[PDB]
């Protein structure tokens, strides 16, 4: 896989962000994770986490996996990096997302994310508290 440029347009919630990619505004849904909705427990904390991570970044990158690049709602499906740190993994590592939505063919970072989740669970962080 490879990283491609994007710029932030706006934070949305824990696992969705609006980015400008190839010069076009798109909502991206983060691969392989599920944050709680804003109205659910830890929802706001996930939203804030992602917000801070993407707003503070000098350099946002999009990395598509090998399979489907857009979902049925027209959201881009990607691993999103903020100054080289993967947002998807960071959420999981902090117990602010679950590994989830693991479909065959867009599952390249699965084992990296599961290892993060196991460590979050060990530490009994947030969702695992
Ligand atoms: C993360 C992800 C979600 N989705 C779809 C599945 C879910 O369909 P349903 O809307 O029918 O439940 C929805 C979950 O996204 P949200 O967690 O953003 O709601 O998005 C994909 O199709 N592919 C993916 O990789
Ligand atoms: Ca969600």
Curated annotation (Swiss-Prot):
Compositionally biased region (Basic and acidic residues): 109-125
Region (Disordered): 109-129
Localization annotation: Secreted
Record: residues binding Ca(2+): 15, 34-35
Residues at the catalytic site: 29, 37, 75
Protein name, as recorded: Nuclease A
Organism classification: Bacteria, Bacillati, Bacillota, Bacilli, Bacillales
